[model samples]
Target: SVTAGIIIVGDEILKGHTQDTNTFFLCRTLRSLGVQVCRVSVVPDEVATIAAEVTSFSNRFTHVLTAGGIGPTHDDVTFEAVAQAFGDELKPHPKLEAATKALGGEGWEKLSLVPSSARLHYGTDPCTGQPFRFPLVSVRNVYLFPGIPELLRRVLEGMKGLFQNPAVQFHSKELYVAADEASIAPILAEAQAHFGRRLGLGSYPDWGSNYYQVKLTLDSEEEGPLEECLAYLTARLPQGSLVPYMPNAVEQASEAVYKLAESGSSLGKKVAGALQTIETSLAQYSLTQLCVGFNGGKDCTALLHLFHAAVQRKLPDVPNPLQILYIRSISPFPELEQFLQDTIKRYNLQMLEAEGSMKQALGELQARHPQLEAVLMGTRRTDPYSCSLCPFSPTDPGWPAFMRINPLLDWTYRDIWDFLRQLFVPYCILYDRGYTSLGSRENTVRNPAPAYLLEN
Candidate 1:
């Protein structure tokens, strides 16, 4: 098996001034190519220290990757140190100079130094159909990289020939149970021994969640053995031990969109296009893989109702128990909570309500149910990121990775309330009192944007 070592060289990283995320991206990409990361080191931007780390990592692992200090400044010395370590000179590659010479004059020459033996790279990926300026340096097995995350990835992606490994793929199946790792430990051990190298099992536990108590992951390279291991687990575990993992569900949500488009009602006509958009999103996922962002407001309420109806009408055979989540702060409005509870009961929803941040709550859920893919938000054009959202978009920056689904992406405030009004869906009483929104419960009394009173 091919193995890798990472050397993070930057005072900023060592001092906690900058989070080291490049290592994560690098390691994951390597894994996809069957490379195992054996060691990781974060060192300051000292040339000698970086060289030492590189030399040690290179000796210990099959591949070595170093990030940082490749910038344009006196502090940038990774190239020079690595050159010293390899008994080579740090010089600007002809191609690097060729790519930057016109603009750089002599100014850019200082930062263009790659290891003497570094090879120029080119590609069509995010490609410029030209030799990339930042060529990959391969001094023995040690590869040099820039400290900046974006540039590191761009260079590594184009330099694929060096890190090739066995063509092995991993298959995984996750199951949730209302128990902790302790209760499942014996079973996991048994599965491990029985399945041996063919299978890998993991158990995660935490504060009560949907299946919420614990999550189990089973991984392998072969499908037959994985399914068998899963079968053994499903058969051995209690009847209610298995929880829904989202897959093959999005197609149905899309199909439901078409049905809503054809659905004939004055209300249907108003949002058929939007509803179709929603359905396209719903159909793109398994009913269980998504979480609804509910705030007991007209928009979310309408979305929940429409979602339930669509699943029932379209995926009748498949249970329509949706994952609804609401994030509440320390201080909250009783009226808003009541509305959500009532709506949950009305729809017979499968839901979670948390009093802290969405990350802590949703992040906990994701850790357990790693298969959780998309989140269903009631976001519309009126919201901050609605402009970039379609039926699906990337999740909020710096949070967990998941697709953000906004079926109401193109809908407006008027459309949201009108649809809910016709359906007679219950929403927070704050709106009736002239409040257009009933969110930020932490400071309405509380966290606020109530600067302008939309007094009734």
Candidate 2:
């Protein structure tokens, strides 16, 4: 198994002047590549402390990654510290000096002071298809990265190829249950005893979730023990306590949209255009950084369907559950609420619930997910208060900032129904009963226009 130790060097991190986000990003990336991060620690800018930690980590782990203190500033002593830890001395590397000279700014000479034996590693620039300007400085098994999160991310992106080990793989499975930890503690204990060190078992609880109270995680490098552990625990759990896995809704949704596109109907053509819009958004943002705004209405339901198809196309085996930004009303229809609850689970949505007005809820949502850059909405040109909305519009000046991705902005009233019915995608029951729009009982009522034709 590949193991790693991360050393975060800087007084700014120790003093809380800057948050250490590089560790989290590195851990996630390394884990995906089947690397086990055994130890992570924060150190001051002092050369002795950084060198001691680097020496200890380099001897103990397969890979040692040092973050921060790699710049040319006064506090940037990581290169010197690491060199001393490995019994080496800093000297100007010709290649690095040339690159720094090209950058041509004050302190650029200081950047060239890398260890004599240090090799500069460069990754391809994602934008230009050429090698990046800066290189990752490495000596033996230790790699040094800048303190800035953005630069560190780019360096890692280019360097990840060196860390990839095809022979080592890690697998994990999660089972969500509505039961509390205490109630399932005995089963977990028994499972731990049964599997011992062969399988890793863990139980995590979510206080805010309405669907599951506890999430049980089991992992093993080998699949046989993982399956055995899962089956043993699943048998011990009480009936009707487990949160059932939803059908492969993403696959079904995508197939439906593809069928529509192949049919050559007018709605089919419109759907193709909407699908193009959705694919464009997916390209710009990660699945984690974009949330689908759903209200259990016809428009959003169509939006979800389109988004799911695009999501599956982008990532067939998406690791995380899709995020749904559902702004709750003080008073909501029973049917709408029921549909919301059912669909949220069916589509495997991680609901981000917020109350009050749209702006307030969006503000709160932004606070919770600061990385969120865009929101996929189901707005149409015919919808009330959306007269000025285009397919892509930033939030109004006073609202919480995010790009409003309206894939259905060009879709009309009949076009929505034709797409839904033709695709056989499930929708809210209220829509069949003449409710053109769904909201709280105080503000919404079924449209009498559809009923008039039925009565006549």
lDDT of 2 by residue, 205-309 (tens): 975333467988888887788889877877998876777533344566777687787777899889988998988888888878899998778788889888888
What are the TM-scores, per candidate, against the unseen true structure?
0.57, 0.57
lDDT scores of the candidates, listed in order: 0.70, 0.81
Number of clashing residue pairs in every model? 13, 0
Q: What is the lDDT of residue 283 in candidate 2?
A: 85
TM-score of 2: 0.57
Which runs in model 2 stand beyond 4 Å of their true positions? 245-456
